């Protein structure tokens, strides 16, 4: 019960954007919170979520799947707004010129998933498979993790993967920033709408001044020039408060996948 506190406010995420964007987000959070905030990048959602649950981050930008997986150990801070709504889709992508009708035609593909703890990069496609009585090992000739949504698009564009499961927000953003790369892909399947990947805190930190200041920095991010500059680079509109109810559609798919196979 001797308290442990960090030397600096730590904000965890996966590399969701270019280094210049992340530097600008770090600068914004430092400015809004009124003291140093350090961005801690990890490769995987397992890594970021584990650091947050164990009290080695003040907050983290995670995914609805890891959030619902550790629902009792985590509190929602804020949900991003994209194209005016706190929701997104999983895209199943193939090569631009690939001649197939739908999901069934992907049998025997090499498939690129993003991360085993990603809603849009794994769980949605896993739900499509499980509903039809198959797993990735049975349906695909090979499946692998890229540990990055932009990397799924690169894997399909380069022809190393026949198909891929990607965050629809990331595909739409990349279409504007790297149009010649994304033009080598097309969307075969769009999923249902799910809660946009949220910012969360450890359950034992509701009272925390650090979490309160990070929450305010996110909700008030449009108030100042630097905040609006970061949001413009992310193609996000801001952050809103949500309840766990917003992530019920992801919880439902987790329960479905658990009950099947």
CA distance 165 to 213: 35
Coil/strand/helix, residue 128: helix
Give the C-alpha separation, 4 to 7, whole Å.
10
What phi and psi values does residue 82 have, to the nearest 5 degrees? -130, 125
* Number of Cβ atoms within 10 Å of the Cβ of 107: 11
Cα separation, 218 vs 174, whole angstroms: 23
Domains identified in the chain, total number: 2
Residue in the block written with tokens 């920095």: 217
Please say whether the beta carbons of 194 and 248 come within 8 A. no
User: Does residue 204 share a domain with residue 187?
Assistant: no
Residue 60, SS3? strand
Q: Which of 150, 172, 191 is the last residue of a domain?
A: 191
Identify which of 45, 37, 36 has the alpha carbon closest to the alpha carbon of residue 13: 45
Q: Phi and psi dihedrals of 235, rounded to 5?
A: 55, 40
What is the stated resolution of the deposited model, in angstroms? 1.8
**Looking at the domain assignment, is residue 248 inside a domain?**
no
Burial of 146 (0-12, 13-18, 19+ CB in 10 A): buried
- Contact predicate 87/193, CB 8 Å: yes
DSSP SS3 for 144: strand
Residue 17 sits in a domain whose CATH number is 3.40.190.10
Backbone φ and ψ of 187, nearest 5°: -85, 115
Nearest to 23 by CA among 38, 33, 6, 34: 38
Contact 222, 236 (CB under 8 A): no
In a domain, 172, yes or no: yes
From the list 207, 169, 213, the residue with the least C-alpha distance to 78 is 213
Asked if 95 and 21 sit in the same domain, the reply is: no
Residue with the two structure tokens 């500059």: 229
């Amino acid at each position: 019960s001797e308290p442990m506190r960090p030397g600096v406010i730590r904000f965890g995420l996966t590399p969701v954007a270019d280094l210049e964007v992340l530097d600008e987000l770090q600068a914004y959070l430092t400015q809004a919170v009124g003291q140093e905030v350090q961005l801690i990048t990890q490769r995987t959602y397992q890594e970021v979520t584990a650091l947050l649950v164990s009290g080695n981050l003040e907050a983290a930008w995670i995914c609805g799947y890891p959030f619902m997986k550790f629902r009792d150990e985590l509190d929602l801070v804020a949900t991003p707004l994209w194209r005016g709504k706190p929701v997104y889709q999983s895209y199943l992508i193939v090569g631009r010129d690939r001649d197939i009708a739908g999901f069934e035609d992907c049998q025997g593909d090499i498939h690129a998933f993003s991360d085993p703890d990603s809603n849009s990069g794994y769980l949605v496609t896993k739900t499509y498979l499980a509903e039809r009585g198959v797993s990735e090992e049975g349906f695909f000739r090979k499946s692998f993790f890229t540990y990055g949504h932009r990397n799924v698009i690169r894997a399909v564009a380069s022809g190393l993967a026949d198909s891929g499961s990607v965050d629809g927000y990331v595909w739409e953003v990349m279409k504007t920033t790297e149009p010649e790369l994304v033009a080598k892909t097309r969307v075969l399947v769009k999923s249902g709408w799910h809660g946009f990947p949220p910012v969360a805190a450890a359950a034992g930190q509701r009272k925390s001044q650090a979490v309160a200041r990070i929450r305010s920095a996110l909700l008030d991010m449009n108030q100042e020039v630097l905040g609006r500059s970061v949001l413009t680079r992310l193609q996000l509109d801001g952050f809103v408060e949500t309840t766990a109810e917003s992530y019920d559609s992801i919880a439902a798919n987790m329960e479905r996948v658990r009950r099947l196979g």
